[PDB]
Amino acid sequence: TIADMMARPAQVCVERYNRLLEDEEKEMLAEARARLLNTQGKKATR
RNA sequence: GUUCGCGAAGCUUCGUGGACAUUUGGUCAAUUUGAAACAAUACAGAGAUGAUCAGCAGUUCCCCUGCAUAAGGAUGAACCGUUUUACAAAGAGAUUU
Ligand SMILES: [Mg+2]
C-alpha cells in the first residue's frame, strides 16, 4: 500500500525504510532471437 | 363391325344412303464422344501461439452431409499475398532562353 502511495516499488521502499553457463546463454539467445524476429508459425511458414 | 332405311335374287344372301365411333405418343430415340463420384499410387501434410488443443463467427462468381431456419463438415473449401499518385507548399544548388 505504502509503495503504491509513493509510486515506488515495494521491496526497494522497504529497504529504504530499513536503512532509515556461456554455452547456454549463446543457445538461448539464438533461440530467443529466432523467436522474436520470426513472425511465423505453422500456417505462415507453410 | 354394329346397325335403321332403300333396290335385286331365293325370313336368307348380295348391292347401296345414313347413323354410331372419329388424329395417340416424344424436353427421351439402345456402348465408348456431352460430361457422377469415391478409391488407388506417388508426394507432402494439420488456425492463432513457443507448443498442444476447444469452440464460435466472417468474406466469397466453392460446395458436400443433413428434413432442416438443428447440427456437422481439415477452425468444412479459397482468404496468410500484393502493398510507389484525389499529392501539394517552402528553402538551397545546377544547365538551357
Ligand atoms: Mg475441428
HEC secondary structure over A2-43:
HHHHHCCCHHHHHHHHHHCCHHHHHHHHHHHHHHHHCCCCCC
Q: Which three cell numbers stand for residue A45?
A: 511458414
Q: How far is the CA of A46 from the centre of ligand 1 (A)?
A: 19
Question: Which technique?
Answer: cryo-EM
CA of A14 to C1' of B49 (A): 39
- The answer to whether A2 touches A13, Cβ cutoff 8 Å, is yes
How big is the CA angle at A29 (ends A24 and A35), to the nearest 5 degrees? 130
Chain B: positions less than 7 Å from a protein CB are: 45-52, 75, 80
Cα distances from A19 to residues A15, A36, A40, in angstroms, run 6, 41, 50
Instruction: Count Cβ neighbours within 10 Å for each residue of A21-31 and write b for 16 or more, e otherwise.
Output: eeeeeeeeeee
How far apart (Å, rounded) are the C-alpha atoms in residues A17 and A31? 41
* Separation between Cα atoms, residue A8 and residue A16, nearest integer Å: 11
**Resolution of the coordinates in A?**
3.8
Q: Distance between CA A3 and CA A12 in Å, rounded?
A: 9
